[PDB]
Design an enzyme around this catalytic site. Structure first.
Site, mmCIF file in Angstrom:
data_model
loop_
_atom_site.group_PDB
_atom_site.id
_atom_site.type_symbol
_atom_site.label_atom_id
_atom_site.label_comp_id
_atom_site.label_asym_id
_atom_site.label_seq_id
_atom_site.Cartn_x
_atom_site.Cartn_y
_atom_site.Cartn_z
ATOM 1 N N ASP A 1 -20.289 -57.637 83.991
ATOM 2 C CA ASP A 1 -21.022 -58.440 84.424
ATOM 3 C C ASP A 1 -22.559 -57.673 85.125
ATOM 4 O O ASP A 1 -22.346 -56.906 85.786
ATOM 5 C CB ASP A 1 -20.465 -59.318 85.716
ATOM 6 C CG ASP A 1 -21.215 -60.180 86.141
ATOM 7 O OD1 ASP A 1 -21.756 -61.245 85.423
ATOM 8 O OD2 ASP A 1 -21.356 -60.502 87.477
ATOM 9 N N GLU B 1 -23.285 -57.565 79.700
ATOM 10 C CA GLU B 1 -24.176 -58.647 79.624
ATOM 11 C C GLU B 1 -25.383 -58.259 80.213
ATOM 12 O O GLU B 1 -25.690 -58.415 81.716
ATOM 13 C CB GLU B 1 -23.700 -59.853 80.374
ATOM 14 C CG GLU B 1 -24.587 -60.907 80.661
ATOM 15 C CD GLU B 1 -25.021 -61.460 82.094
ATOM 16 O OE1 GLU B 1 -24.741 -60.862 83.047
ATOM 17 O OE2 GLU B 1 -25.514 -62.666 82.026
HETATM 18 C C1 LIG Z 1 -26.603 -65.979 85.911
HETATM 19 C C2 LIG Z 1 -27.457 -64.780 85.443
HETATM 20 O O1 LIG Z 1 -28.503 -64.468 86.607
HETATM 21 C C3 LIG Z 1 -29.414 -63.185 86.309
HETATM 22 O O2 LIG Z 1 -30.030 -63.767 85.045
HETATM 23 C C4 LIG Z 1 -31.828 -63.773 85.264
HETATM 24 C C5 LIG Z 1 -32.387 -62.905 84.318
HETATM 25 O O3 LIG Z 1 -31.944 -61.490 84.498
HETATM 26 C C6 LIG Z 1 -33.703 -63.358 84.432
HETATM 27 O O4 LIG Z 1 -34.533 -62.258 83.873
HETATM 28 C C7 LIG Z 1 -34.056 -64.490 84.289
HETATM 29 O O5 LIG Z 1 -33.847 -64.796 82.991
HETATM 30 C C8 LIG Z 1 -34.816 -65.550 82.011
HETATM 31 C C9 LIG Z 1 -35.028 -64.783 80.919
HETATM 32 O O6 LIG Z 1 -35.467 -63.455 81.578
HETATM 33 C C10 LIG Z 1 -36.230 -65.315 80.255
HETATM 34 O O7 LIG Z 1 -35.934 -64.799 78.714
HETATM 35 C C11 LIG Z 1 -36.269 -67.116 80.256
HETATM 36 O O8 LIG Z 1 -36.303 -67.479 79.016
HETATM 37 O O9 LIG Z 1 -35.035 -67.683 80.974
HETATM 38 C C12 LIG Z 1 -34.255 -66.821 81.760
HETATM 39 C C13 LIG Z 1 -33.748 -67.686 83.010
HETATM 40 O O10 LIG Z 1 -34.835 -68.005 83.740
HETATM 41 O O11 LIG Z 1 -33.348 -65.391 85.206
HETATM 42 C C14 LIG Z 1 -31.933 -65.367 84.953
HETATM 43 C C15 LIG Z 1 -31.424 -66.201 86.149
HETATM 44 O O12 LIG Z 1 -31.658 -65.817 87.416
HETATM 45 C C16 LIG Z 1 -28.628 -61.987 85.826
HETATM 46 O O13 LIG Z 1 -29.334 -61.149 85.456
HETATM 47 C C17 LIG Z 1 -27.344 -62.204 84.941
HETATM 48 O O14 LIG Z 1 -26.470 -60.993 84.737
HETATM 49 C C18 LIG Z 1 -26.745 -63.426 85.601
HETATM 50 N N1 LIG Z 1 -25.158 -63.855 84.663
HETATM 51 C C19 LIG Z 1 -24.030 -62.975 85.082
HETATM 52 C C20 LIG Z 1 -23.898 -62.774 86.778
HETATM 53 C C21 LIG Z 1 -23.575 -63.628 87.508
HETATM 54 C C22 LIG Z 1 -23.446 -62.913 88.836
HETATM 55 O O15 LIG Z 1 -22.132 -62.251 89.083
HETATM 56 C C23 LIG Z 1 -22.876 -64.711 87.055
HETATM 57 O O16 LIG Z 1 -23.372 -65.779 88.198
HETATM 58 C C24 LIG Z 1 -23.016 -65.447 85.816
HETATM 59 O O17 LIG Z 1 -22.143 -66.528 85.577
HETATM 60 C C25 LIG Z 1 -22.657 -64.125 85.102
HETATM 61 O O18 LIG Z 1 -22.507 -64.306 83.607
#
Ligand SMILES: C[C@H]1O[C@H](O[C@H]2[C@H](O)[C@@H](O)[C@@H](O[C@H]3[C@H](O)[C@@H](O)[C@@H](O)O[C@@H]3CO)O[C@@H]2CO)[C@H](O)[C@@H](O)[C@@H]1N[C@H]1C=C(CO)[C@@H](O)[C@H](O)[C@H]1O
Ligand SMILES: C[C@H]1O[C@H](O[C@H]2[C@H](O)[C@@H](O)[C@@H](O[C@H]3[C@H](O)[C@@H](O)[C@@H](O)O[C@@H]3CO)O[C@@H]2CO)[C@H](O)[C@@H](O)[C@@H]1N[C@H]1C=C(CO)[C@@H](O)[C@H](O)[C@H]1O
Ligand SMILES: [Ca+2]
Ligand SMILES: [Ca+2]
Ligand code: NA
Ligand code: NA
Length: 481
Positions: free
Chosen positions: A229, A259
């Protein structure tokens, strides 16, 4: 012979404690349809019973101790999970456990901590003097005690937090004497901080503890691998070392996929380089191409699907997917591949030779959010494509990405899989025909569309070519009758 992953959850599953039992009961169906590994949601106690699992309160409570108002996690008990795993293993389905080690949520008590605020768009920039805050950083695990681990957490195991309980305020606080970890994503200056209490990977007791827990977790659930994660937010060299440590201790391959959420192949390549290519990443750019194609009404240039993806450049290290629990409707990375296009995206990941494809529980069985935009159950449209992968998608591939809308590929078949070979077409616009080469070795065979979208038979000519058809906005996958 082809490997096929399944993400075995979606965000909005009901909190009835029956998921592990469901997974146990689905093991024959999964094996029958060619699934060879499942990624299970985080299996340890979150901040409440209805936590999807990313809260990460107690990594040693797998639904075993009465903590946070419940024994079971959302998904069920430890014993139920272990019974599901032994059923999956009985049909040679591997299990990958979700690894949530960026942070810890739901601390048992607050501690007074000296901190400074940082700028949420540039976390290297300090925006206050020192102040006293009340941070959720003390983890005692009162329901567990020292069973399995006597390690307790305090504020000095963390770099910071996003909540001061005294002033009742949401900002990013960096604790006295702490520094954000590096290397992490350079987004927002330094993206170490994400949510809850952020683990300090400069602390040697923390690095030791998390590695040790990793081995324990692998043993406790007989895991075959991991999904990591939030790797943008965790020191990359630590992730590399952690994977190496667990592999060394278990003596197993421990397939791992991280991820790293970025729609940018360059950023993903940097991550791969800094972790010495020792594990795979999700193909985030390919997901965004599918989303774009699905929302542009035929205006997308389908030839683009071959470029700018992890699978295009590092196919051994790509886990390809269509949607996940964050991209589904209502969730934090919402960018859902529209229903009409979704089978075409599944054909692309399932029947092409490059990548380790992953199917989504939400796509198979639908999503159970409260909106009128939920993903409908597409099991019946995906099943023929899974069968194509299991029985037919072998041997040399030929690509026909020579049109703005109608693209295709063929697989010649392999003599190790009887009757294998396929001819796939997808189109984001009007349908039509395409002549494609399937191998002279298939000359004279009569092929039919395994999806049933087209009812016509195609006889392969002496030269190994067939004339294949596809409907508007559709997919056809022809295989030997
Ligand atoms: C839920 C998710 O949050 C974090 O992701 C963020 C990205 O790191 C950011 O770069 C930004 O993403 C944007 C893209 O960069 C861009 O290409 C655009 O088109 O849209 C995207 C959305 O704005 O914002 C994201 C959302 O804050 C984090 O890096 C990622 O790892 C997270 N996912 C996992 C982590 C957690 C926390 O333990 C969980 O809540 C999720 O279910 C996981 O799968
Ligand atoms: C399931 C398997 O997926 C991964 O390996 C596959 C690659 O992703 C594919 O791209 C393809 O690799 C070929 C390249 O595309 C091609 O450019 C050329 O270099 O030849 C490559 C080899 O043919 O096919 C690969 C599968 O053969 C991933 O790297 C690998 O670790 C995955 N295997 C695990 C999965 C399961 C169950 O699902 C276990 O049975 C295995 O023991 C695991 O190792
Ligand atoms: Ca972090
Ligand atoms: Ca640190
Ligand atoms: Na940190
Ligand atoms: Na198009």
């Amino acid at each position: 012979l082809n490997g096929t992953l399944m993400q075995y959850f979606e965000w909005y599953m009901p909190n009835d404690g029956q998921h592990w039992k469901r997974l146990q009961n689905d093991s024959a169906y999964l094996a029958e349809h060619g699934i060879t590994a499942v990624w299970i949601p985080p299996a340890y106690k979150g901040t409440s019973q209805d936590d999807v699992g990313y809260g990460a309160y107690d990594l040693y409570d797998l639904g075993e101790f009465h903590q946070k108002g419940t024994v079971r996690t959302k998904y069920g008990t430890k014993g139920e999970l272990q019974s599901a795993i032994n059923s999956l293993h009985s049909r040679d389905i591997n299990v990958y456990g979700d690894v949530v080690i960026n942070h810890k949520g739901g601390a048992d008590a607050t501690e007074y901590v000296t901190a400074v605020e940082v700028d949420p768009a540039d976390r290297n920039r300090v925006t206050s003097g020192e102040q006293r805050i009340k941070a959720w950083t003390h983890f005692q695990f009162p329901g567990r005690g020292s069973t399995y681990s006597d390690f307790k957490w305090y504020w000095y195991h963390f770099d910071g937090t996003d909540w001061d309980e005294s002033r009742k305020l949401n900002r990013i606080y960096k604790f006295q004497g702490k520094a954000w970890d590096w290397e992490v994503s350079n987004e927002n200056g330094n993206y170490d901080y994400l949510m809850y209490a952020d683990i300090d990977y400069d602390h040697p007791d923390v690095t030791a503890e998390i590695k040790r827990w990793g081995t324990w977790y692998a043993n406790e659930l007989q895991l075959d691998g991991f999904r990591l994660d939030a790797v943008k937010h965790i020191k990359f060299s630590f992730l590399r070392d952690w994977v190496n440590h667990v592999r060394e201790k278990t003596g197993k391959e421990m397939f791992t996929v991280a991820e790293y959420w970025q729609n940018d192949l360059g950023a993903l390549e940097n991550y791969l380089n800094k972790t010495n290519f020792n594990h795979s990443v999700f193909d985030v750019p390919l997901h965004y191409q599918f989303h774009a194609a699905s929302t542009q009404g035929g205006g997308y240039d389908m030839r683009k699907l071959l470029n700018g993806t992890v699978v295009s450049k590092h196919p051994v290290k790509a886990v390809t997917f269509v949607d996940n629990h964050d991209t589904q409707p209502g969730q934090s990375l919402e960018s859902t591949v529209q229903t009409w296009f979704k089978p075409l995206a599944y054909a692309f990941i399932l029947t092409r030779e490059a990548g380790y494809p992953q199917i989504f529980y939400g796509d198979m069985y639908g999503t159970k959010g409260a909106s009128q935009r939920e993903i409908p159950a597409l099991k019946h449209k995906i099943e023929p494509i899974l069968k194509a992968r299991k029985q037919y998608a072998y041997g040399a591939q030929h690509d026909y990405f020579d049109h703005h809308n109608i693209v295709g590929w063929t697989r010649e078949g392999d003599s190790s899989v009887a009757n294998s070979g396929l001819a796939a077409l997808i189109t984001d616009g009007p349908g039509g025909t395409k002549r494609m080469y399937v191998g002279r070795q298939n000359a004279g065979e009569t092929w039919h569309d395994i999806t049933g979208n087209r009812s016509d038979s195609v006889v392969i000519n002496a030269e190994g070519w067939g004339e294949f058809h596809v409907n508007g906005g559709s997919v056809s996958i022809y295989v030997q009758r």
